[PDB]
C-alpha cells in the first residue's frame, strides 16, 4: 500500500496525472470560453 503510493509519486505518473488534470481544465475553459484572442473583461 505504502509502496503503491510511492510508485504513484514517481515522475512519469505524477506528470501524467498532473498534465491530464491540466489538459482537462484547459479544455473546459476553452469549452465555456472558446476562441478569445483578448482579455475581454477589462
Amino acid at each position: 500500500m505504502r509502496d503503491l503510493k510511492t510508485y504513484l509519486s514517481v515522475a512519469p505518473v505524477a506528470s501524467t496525472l498532473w498534465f491530464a488534470a491540466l489538459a482537462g481544465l484547459l479544455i473546459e475553459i476553452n469549452r465555456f470560453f472558446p476562441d478569445a484572442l483578448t482579455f475581454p473583461f477589462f
Partner: protein, 743 residues
C-alpha cells in the same frame, strides 16, 4: 530425454515494494541517480534481461511473461479496433455501397475546431477515413451488424485479460523450467501442426460455413439485414445447399475420397472475382484447407517421446562438406543457449515475410473491395514494407549482440561461423566492391539521363525511346506466368495474378482494380536502385556483425561491449566502431532503401494501373502514364512526382485532410530537429549546461540530480530516432493526403 511439463512454484513474490524502487533490476542503477544520465539508463537497460542476470532460466521466464504482455496489448488493440468499428463507424453504410462510401472508424470531439476533421465520408457520416482495411476484413469474414463487432471486441478484451493473467502466472506462480523452454523439437512440432495447422484448419472451417455463403448473398445484392445469420447456415443445411450444393452430402465424399464433388466451393480458378475485386473466396478457403493439411503434416518431423521423429542435432551434424569443414556441428548448442541468436534469425525471417506480404497483398487482393480502396492498399503496402525493414535491421542488431556476448569458441564452437570469421575481410571487401559497382550502374544512369535531358539530347539518354535497357528476364517470367493456366497449370482457370495475364482487366465501380503491369527501362533502373540500396544496407549491417569482436584497428573490441561510443581520438579516430553504431547507420540506409521502394510503388500504381475506366473500356490513369518518360530522371522524380503530388497535402488546409497538412510540416520539423543531434557532440552541450547551472545556482534553484548532456550513444540514438520519425511521418502524411484526395 522425455519431454514433459516442468515448472517451479512461487519463484518471485508479488509485491509493490520493487515497484517503488526505480532501477531495481540493475545493481548500479538501484542506488538512485547522482546525475541525470541515470534517468536515461533506466529506460535503455529496461529490457536488457541478459545484462540484469546471467541465469538463463530467469531470462527465459522474463521473456515468456514479456511475450504474454505483448499478446495482451495486441488483443487490447484489436478490441479497440472492433469496438470502434461497432460504436463510432459507418460500416453498415459502407456495406451497402462499398464503391462510394469512404471507410471511417474515428470521430473527433468538437472542442477547438477539430470537428473539421470529421469530414463527409458518405452514408450520413462525418469522420476520419481509415486506411487500415478493417472494413474489407470484416466483410470477407461475413460480419454484417454492429453487434458482431461488439461481441468480437468483448472477446478480444477477455483474451487480453487472459494473456495478462498468464503472463503474471508463468512468472510469479508456476514458472516453467529451462529444459521446458529448451524442448525445441516439441515446440516446433506444436507450432507447425498445433498453431499453424489447426489455425489454418479452423479458419478454413469458418470460411466454408460463414464467409462463402454470407459473401454470396452480399455479392447477389441481398440487403445485409435481410441476410440470414451465420449460425442459420449451420442448422438448416438447405440454406448452405441452395448456395453450394455439395453441402447436401455431409462429409461423405471426404471420407469416401470423392473430393471431386467439393469443387463447387473449393475451386482453383484464380484471378479476381470481377464483382468485388478480391480473390475468389472459394479459392481462399481451399487454400487454407491445403495449408492446414501441410502444416498438420509438417508438425511431425521432430522426435519427442515416442522414438519416431527427427533430432535436429543429428540433422545439423550430418551436413558438413569439403568447403565448410565440420559445418553445422555445434549450431544446435548455440541456438539452444543464446536468445539473441534466435531473435536475429526470427527478426530477419519475419521482416522478409512482412515484405513478401506487402507484395502479395497488392498483386493478389485478398479481401473484397480492397483493390479499389486505393488509400487502404497504399497504406497497407507502405506499412508492411516499413515493418519488414525495421525487423531486418533488428535481426542485424541481435546477431551482433550474440557475437559480442554469447559467442565463445572454447565452449560452444561451430565450424561454419569460425570459417566466416576467418575471411570477414574478403567478404566485406567484395560486398564493398559490389555496392560501388551498383551505385555507379544505377544512380549514375540517372545522372547521365539528367545531364542528357538538360543538354537538349533526349536521344542520348537511357529511355524506352533511346538507349533501351529492357528487363527482359522479368518480362519473360511474367509472360511465362501468363501462359501457365491450361499448360503448366491445367487446374488453374485464370492467371495467378492479373499483373501476369495479358488482358483480363478487372474494374470495380468505375475504378480499375488490376491490369497487366508494364515493365520498361524505368522499371529496370528502379530495380537496380533497389538492389544497390539493399546491398549497401546489408554491407553496413553485416560488416558491423562480423567485426564486432576484433579488427586490425581495435583487436579487443569485444571487451568494450556491444554498445559503446568509441575508443578514443587516437589511431586517427575511432568513432562509431561499435556494432551498435553499425545498426545506427544501417537504420538510415534501410530508410533510404524503403523510401525509394515505396515511392516506386506509389508512382507506378498511380501511372500504369490505378485510374478511371469508361463505359466503353477507356482507362485514364491517375497520372497520364508518365512513368516511362519522367521516372528515368532525377529531375522527373523531383517535378512530376514530389512537386506534383504534394499539392494535395499543401492544399489540405480548411478541409478534413488538414491534419495531414499539419503532420507534413511537423514531421519536417522533427526530421530537421534530429540534425542538431546528428551533427554535434555532447561536449559543447555539457559546456553550455555548465553556464546554465551557474545561472540556476545563483538563484538557489539548481537540482541535486546534476544535469548532464546526453551520452554519445544516446545522442546518436535520439538523432536516428527523430530522423526516422520525421522522414516516415512526412511520407505518411503526403501519401495519405494524396491518395485519399485523388482516390
Amino acid at each position: 530425454p522425455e519431454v514433459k511439463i516442468l515448472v517451479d512454484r512461487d519463484p518471485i513474490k508479488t509485491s509493490f515494494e520493487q515497484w517503488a524502487k526505480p532501477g531495481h533490476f540493475s545493481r548500479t542503477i538501484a542506488k538512485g541517480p547522482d546525475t541525470t544520465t541515470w534517468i536515461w539508463n533506466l529506460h535503455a537497460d529496461a529490457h536488457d534481461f541478459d545484462s540484469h542476470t546471467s541465469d538463463l532460466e530467469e531470462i527465459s521466464r522474463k521473456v515468456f511473461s514479456a511475450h504474454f504482455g505483448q499478446l495482451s496489448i495486441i488483443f487490447l488493440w484489436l478490441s479497440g479496433m472492433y469496438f470502434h468499428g461497432a460504436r463510432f463507424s459507418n460500416y453498415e453504410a459502407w456495406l451497402n455501397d462499398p464503391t462510394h462510401i469512404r471507410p471511417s472508424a474515428q470521430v473527433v470531439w468538437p472542442i477547438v475546431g477539430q470537428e473539421i476533421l470529421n469530414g463527409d465520408v458518405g452514408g450520413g457520416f462525418r469522420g476520419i477515413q481509415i486506411t487500415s482495411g478493417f472494413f474489407q476484413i470484416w466483410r470477407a469474414s461475413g460480419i454484417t451488424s454492429e453487434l458482431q463487432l461488439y461481441c468480437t471486441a468483448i472477446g478480444a478484451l477477455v483474451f487480453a485479460a487472459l494473456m495478462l493473467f498468464a503472463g503474471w502466472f508463468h512468472y510469479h506462480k508456476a514458472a516453467p523450467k529451462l529444459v521446458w523452454f529448451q524442448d525445441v523439437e516439441s515446440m516446433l512440432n506444436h507450432h507447425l501442426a498445433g498453431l499453424l495447422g489447426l489455425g489454418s484448419l479452423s479458419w478454413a472451417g469458418h470460411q466454408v460455413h460463414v464467409s462463402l455463403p454470407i459473401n454470396q448473398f452480399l455479392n447477389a445484392g441481398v440487403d445485409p439485414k435481410e441476410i440470414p445469420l451465420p449460425h442459420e447456415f449451420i442448422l438448416n443445411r438447405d440454406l448452405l445447399a441452395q448456395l453450394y450444393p455439395s453441402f447436401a452430402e455431409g462429409a461423405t465424399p471426404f471420407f469416401t475420397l470423392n473430393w471431386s464433388k467439393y469443387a463447387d466451393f473449393l475451386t482453383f480458378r484464380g484471378g479476381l472475382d470481377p464483382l468485388t475485386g478480391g480473390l475468389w473466396l472459394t479459392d481462399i478457403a481451399h487454400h487454407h484447407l491445403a495449408i492446414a493439411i501441410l502444416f498438420l503434416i509438417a508438425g511431425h518431423m521432430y522426435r519427442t517421446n515416442w522414438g519416431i521423429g527427427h533430432g535436429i542435432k543429428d540433422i545439423l551434424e550430418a551436413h558438413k562438406g569439403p568447403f565448410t569443414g565440420q559445418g553445422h556441428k555445434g549450431l544446435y548448442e548455440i541456438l539452444t543457449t543464446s536468445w539473441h541468436a534466435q531473435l536475429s534469425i526470427n527478426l530477419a525471417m519475419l521482416g522478409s515475410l512482412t515484405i513478401i506480404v506487402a507484395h502479395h497483398m497488392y498483386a493478389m487482393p485478398p479481401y473484397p473491395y480492397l483493390a479499389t480502396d486505393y488509400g487502404t492498399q497504399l497504406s497497407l503496402f507502405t506499412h508492411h514494407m516499413w515493418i519488414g525493414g525495421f525487423l531486418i535491421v533488428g535481426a542485424a542488431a541481435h546477431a551482433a549482440i550474440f557475437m559480442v556476448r554469447d559467442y565463445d569458441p572454447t565452449t560452444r564452437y561451430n565450424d561454419l561461423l569460425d570459417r566466416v570469421l576467418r575471411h570477414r575481410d574478403a567478404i566485406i571487401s567484395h560486398l564493398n566492391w559490389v555496392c560501388i559497382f551498383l551505385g555507379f550502374h544505377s544512380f549514375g544512369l540517372y545522372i547521365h539521363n539528367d545531364t542528357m535531358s538538360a543538354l537538349g539530347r533526349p536521344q542520348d539518354m537511357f529511355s524506352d525511346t533511346a538507349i533501351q535497357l529492357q528487363p527482359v528476364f522479368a518480362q519473360w517470367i511474367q509472360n511465362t506466368h501468363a501462359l501457365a493456366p491450361g499448360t503448366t497449370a491445367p487446374g488453374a482457370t485464370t492467371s495467378t495474378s492479373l499483373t501476369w495475364g495479358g488482358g483480363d482487366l478487372v474494374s470495380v465501380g468505375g475504378k480499375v482494380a488490376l491490369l497487366p503491369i508494364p515493365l520498361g527501362t524505368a522499371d529496370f533502373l528502379v530495380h537496380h536502385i533497389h538492389a544497390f540500396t539493399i546491398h549497401v544496407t546489408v554491407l553496413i549491417l553485416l560488416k558491423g556483425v562480423l567485426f564486432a569482436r576484433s579488427s586490425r584497428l581495435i583487436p579487443d573490441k569485444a571487451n568494450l561491449g556491444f554498445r559503446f561510443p568509441c575508443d578514443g581520438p587516437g589511431r586517427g579516430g575511432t568513432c562509431q566502431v561499435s556494432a551498435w553504431d553499425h545498426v545506427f547507420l544501417g537504420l538510415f540506409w534501410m530508410y533510404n532503401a524503403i523510401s525509394v521502394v515505396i515511392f516506386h510503388f506509389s508512382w507506378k500504381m498511380q501511372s500504369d494501373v490505378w485510374g478511371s475506366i469508361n463505359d466503353q473500356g477507356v482507362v485514364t490513369h491517375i497520372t497520364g502514364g508518365n512513368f516511362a518518360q519522367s521516372s528515368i530522371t532525377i529531375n522527373g522524380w523531383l517535378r512530376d512526382f514530389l512537386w506534383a503530388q504534394a499539392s494535395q497535402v499543401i492544399q489540405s488546409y480548411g478541409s478534413s485532410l488538414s491534419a495531414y497538412g499539419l503532420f507534413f510540416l511537423g514531421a519536417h520539423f522533427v526530421w530537421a530537429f534530429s540534425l542538431m543531434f546528428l551533427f554535434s557532440g555532447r561536449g559543447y552541450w555539457q559546456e553550455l549546461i555548465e553556464s546554465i547551472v551557474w545561472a540556476h545556482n545563483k538563484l538557489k534553484v539548481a537540482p541535486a540530480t546534476q544535469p548532464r548532456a546526453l551520452s554519445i550513444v544516446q545522442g546518436r540514438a535520439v538523432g536516428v530516432t527523430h530522423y526516422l520519425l520525421g522522414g516516415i511521418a512526412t511520407t505518411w502524411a503526403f501519401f495519405l493526403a494524396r491518395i485519399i484526395a485523388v482516390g
